[PDB]
A paper describes a structure:
In this study, we present the cryo-EM structures of two thermostable multimeric enzymes that have different point-symmetry groups; namely SOR from Acidianus ambivalens and LS from Aquifex aeolicus. The reported cryo-EM structures of the two enzymes including their active sites correlate very well with the x-ray crystal structures.
First, we determined the structure of the Sulfur Oxygenase Reductase (SOR) enzyme that catalyzes both the oxygenation and disproportionation of elemental sulfur in Archea and is composed of 24 homomeric units each of MW ≃ 35 kDa arranged in octahedral symmetry. The resolution of the final cryo-EM map was 2.78 Å according to the estimation from the Fourier shell correlation (FSC) at the 0.143 cut-off criterion. The average root mean square deviation (RMSD) between the cryoEM and x-ray crystal structures of SOR is 0.575 Å for the 307 Cα atoms. The core structure of the monomer is composed of eight β-strands surrounded by nine α-helices. The catalytic active site in each of the 24 monomeric subunits contains a mononuclear non-heme iron site, where the Fe3+ ion is responsible for the positive charge of the inner surface of the hollow cavity in SOR. The density of the side chains of H86, H90 and E114 surrounding the iron center, and that of two water molecules ligated to the Fe3+ ion are distinguishable in our cryo-EM map. The extra density in the cryo-EM map results from CSS31 existing in two rotamer conformations with equal occupancies. These tetramer channel structures formed by the side chain of residues at each of four adjacent subunits are proposed to allow the sulfur substrates to access the inside of the hollow sphere cavity of SOR, where catalysis can take place secluded from the cytoplasmic environment. The exit routes of the polar products such as HSO3−, HS− and S2O32− are proposed to be the hydrophilic trimer channels formed by three subunits positioned along a 3-fold symmetry axis.
Author numbering:
A (entry chain V), B (entry chain D), C (entry chain A): 2 to 308
Write the structure that this text describes.
Amino acid sequence: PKPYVAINMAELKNEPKTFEMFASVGPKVCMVTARHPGFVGFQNHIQIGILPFGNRYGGAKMDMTKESSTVRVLQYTFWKDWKDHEEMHRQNWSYLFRLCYSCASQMIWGPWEPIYEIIYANMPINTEMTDFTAVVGKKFAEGKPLDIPVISQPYGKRVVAFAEHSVIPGKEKQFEDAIVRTLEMLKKAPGFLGAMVLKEIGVSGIGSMQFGAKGFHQVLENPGSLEPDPNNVMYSVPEAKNTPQQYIVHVEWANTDALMFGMGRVLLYPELRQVHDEVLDTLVYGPYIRILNPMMEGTFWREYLNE
Amino acid sequence: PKPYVAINMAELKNEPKTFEMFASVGPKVCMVTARHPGFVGFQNHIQIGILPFGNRYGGAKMDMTKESSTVRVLQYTFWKDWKDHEEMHRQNWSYLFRLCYSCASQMIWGPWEPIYEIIYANMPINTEMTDFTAVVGKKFAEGKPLDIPVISQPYGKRVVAFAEHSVIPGKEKQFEDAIVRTLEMLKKAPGFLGAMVLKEIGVSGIGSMQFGAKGFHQVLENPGSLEPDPNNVMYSVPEAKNTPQQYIVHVEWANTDALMFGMGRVLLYPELRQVHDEVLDTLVYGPYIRILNPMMEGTFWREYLNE
Amino acid sequence: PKPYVAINMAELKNEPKTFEMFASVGPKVCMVTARHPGFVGFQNHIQIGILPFGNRYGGAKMDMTKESSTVRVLQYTFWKDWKDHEEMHRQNWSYLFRLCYSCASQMIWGPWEPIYEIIYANMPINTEMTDFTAVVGKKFAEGKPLDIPVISQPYGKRVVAFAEHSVIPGKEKQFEDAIVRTLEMLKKAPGFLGAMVLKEIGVSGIGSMQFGAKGFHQVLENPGSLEPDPNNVMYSVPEAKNTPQQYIVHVEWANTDALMFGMGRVLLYPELRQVHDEVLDTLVYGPYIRILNPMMEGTFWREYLNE
Ligand SMILES: [Fe+3]
Ligand SMILES: [Fe+3]
Ligand SMILES: [Fe+3]
C-alpha cells in the first residue's frame, strides 16, 4: 500500500560533536517511534550538495560537506495513517522531548516537520551485491523473470535527488499527471534506482516544538529534564497546509555522476524535454534540487509499500 | 503615506570576491530602479547572526560572519504602488537581467522576491551625531518640542531584528492588533530606534527568475548578454500568496546588546509578557529572529513615509 | 515606590566555560522569576576589582579580571514585597533548582542570598546616547526643565562602587542620616550617575540551598534531575539577621577614573570630609569597596521606583 511521510527538517552546526550526537541520540529516538503499531519504517539523510544547473547556482557544488559551516538533516518517517504519527508523538512525549532537546545545543534552524502523502511510488527493495544471486533464483523459480529489480545498496551507498516544486492554484492535477509521465520516461537513465512523488498535506505542531503561550515559555526555560504539556498546540495538521501546492520529487541514483547526467536528461533529451515542459508551466517556485546522502534507514519500509 | 516593500532574498558564497561584486554591481542596479517615478527608496542588509533565545538555537550566535560559509542578503525596495515595481522590472529588463546575472556565479539559493504592504510604521528619519544640534533648533523654533526624534545613525551603524511569523487562518486581525499593542509598549526600551510591521501580499515572478518553459531554458543556457522574454511569467503577484499569513516585524536598535536585551523584554517584563502572550497563540510558525546589518540605504525613503 | 532587593552571592571559577554557562543559564533563570506578579526587575554584576585606598589594600587593583582564579558574582533582584520572593522561589522550585544546580560544577563558595530593603534612592532611568534628544524634548514640552537626568548607559558601560559597612548596636539611625547627608553632598562629583542605600533585613534559606537534615542529604547526592522538599528550611527570613546592622551603599559612575576620584572626595574635600567623619565613628567593620561591572539588567525596574 501507500504510507504517509512525516519529514523532520533541521539545520545544525557542522562540528564533529554534531556527528557524535548523531551517532548516539539517533538510534534511541528511532526506538521510541517503533512503540506504535502503525510505524512502518524510516530513512535519515544529510545534505551534501546542491545541483548547480550549469551556473544557475554558480556557488553550489555536488560536494560541499568539506567547506561548510552548517549541515541540514532530513528525517523521513513512514506511517500507515497520519494520525498514527499524531498519537505516537504525544504518548511517548516524555522520552521524545528530552531526546530531541539534547540535540538543541547545536541547532541553527528548525525543526520543522511537515506531513506528505505518497501519490506515486516506484521504489524497489534494497539489497547488497552479495544478496543478488539468491534473489534472481527465487524469481526464476516462480516463473517471474520480469519482476527482478535493480541492485540498490543500503546504508549510504547511493545518492538522492530531492527536488522541491510549488504549483500555481488551478494547475495541480495537471502537474501530477505530467510529472508521473516524465518519471515514466525518465526511468530509462543509466543508474536510476527508483522514485516517488510526495504531496504536502499539512504540518505537525507537536513535532516542530510549536506550542501556544504556555508551552513556549516552558520550552524557553527548560533545563532539560522537563516537558511542556503536549495538548497546548493551537492548530491541527490540516488546518494550515500551504496554499501553493508543495511537492517533493525523490529520485535515487547509484552515484553523483549518474545523478548529474540523469536529472539533466529532461534538458538534453528532446522527447523528455517536450514532455517535461508541461511541468514547468505550472510552477510558482522550483525546481530546487538538493543532493542527499542516506546515513541510515529502516529498509523494511519498502516491503510494506510493495506488499 | 505608506509604501509597499518588495524584498529580494538570496544566499551567496562568503568569499571576498562576493563583497567585491557587492560593492561594484550594487549601486548600478540601484541606478536602474530610480528610472521609475514611483520608486521612493531602498535599504540593503546582510545577515550577521541569529538570536539564540537562550539555548533554543544553541548553535547560533549574534555574530557569525566570521565562522561561516554562506552570506544571506535581503534588499528592501520601497514603492508607492506595487504595480510600479512590476512596470519598472520589465521596462528596464535588459539592464536588470544582465546586472543581476553577473551576480549568479556566487549564489547558493534564490533569488526570491515576495511583496509586502506596510500596516504600521514608527520609523524616524536618520541623522548623524553631528546633525542633531541643527535639528532640535528647528523644532524648538516652530514650537514643537514633542516631535524631536531619537538619533539613528545611517550607513551601517545600527542593527535590525528581523522577526518572521506565520499566522493560523482565522487569527489574522487578532495578530495585527496584538502586535501593534506590544510594539506600543516595547518602544520604551533603552536603544529602540523604530519599528514597522509588514504583511505579505504576493510574490513577483519576474524578480525571482521564475519563467515558464520557454524562459527557463533561456535562463539556463544564457552566456550573459541575452535576455528571456519578460512576459513569459505564468502567474501574477496576487495569484499565489501563502495560507499562513506571512508577517515581518522589523525593529531597529543601536547595538546588539540593546537588541539582545530589548527583544527579550517581551519575556522578562510581566506587563509586556502578558500583552505578548496573545501574539503567540496565533502562530503557525515563529518567531524566528535574524540579526541584519544595513550596508547601504536610500535614507530619503523615510521622508516619504513621514510626509 | 521602594522595592526590596534579594542579593544572590556566589564565587565561581574564572574559566571560559564559566562565562559560557553565564551566557546560557543566565537568561533562563530570569525567565522563571518573571512568572510572579511582584517581580519588578533585576541586575547582574561581576566583580572586576577592589578599590585599594592608596596602599591600604596594596595587592588589590581596580582591574583584576585578568590575573585571577575566581570570579565573584552578585545578582540583584527587585520585589514589591519580600514575601513575593519567598512565594516565587518555592512555586517554581523544580525549574529553579535544576537551573541553579547546573551551575554548581564551577562554584567555589556560596550561594548566599540575604534580603535588604531600600531606605534611600536616587537612581535615574537608563538611556543610550542616541536616546537623549527625544528625552529632553518631552521634558521641555511639559515645562519641566529641572527633572532631566544624567545619561546612564545600560548593558555594561558604567561601574558600580559596592561599599559594605557594619554598624555598632546603638548607632543605627545616626548612621542612616549621616550617610544620606554625605550622599546628598557627594552627588556633585563629575561622573556621578546615582546611588542607593540598602539595609539588611534577613536571609533566605531556600535561595541559599540551606535545608535541614533531610534536604541536605538530597542536595549532596543529587544527580541533577531531582529536587529536595522546599519546606524543609528550618528558619524564616527575619529569624536570623546579624547584630552589626549590614548596610550596602551602591554608587554608580561613568568610569573607573570617576569612581577612583569621586569616592575619594570624602577624603580630600574638607566639607565632605567633616560630614563623612560621622559615618566612620559608628562602624564595626568597613568600608570595604568592591568594583562591579553590570553584565545585564532588567532596566525597567528603575521605572517602578520612580513612578
Ligand atoms: Fe514527528
Ligand atoms: Fe524586484
Ligand atoms: Fe532568591
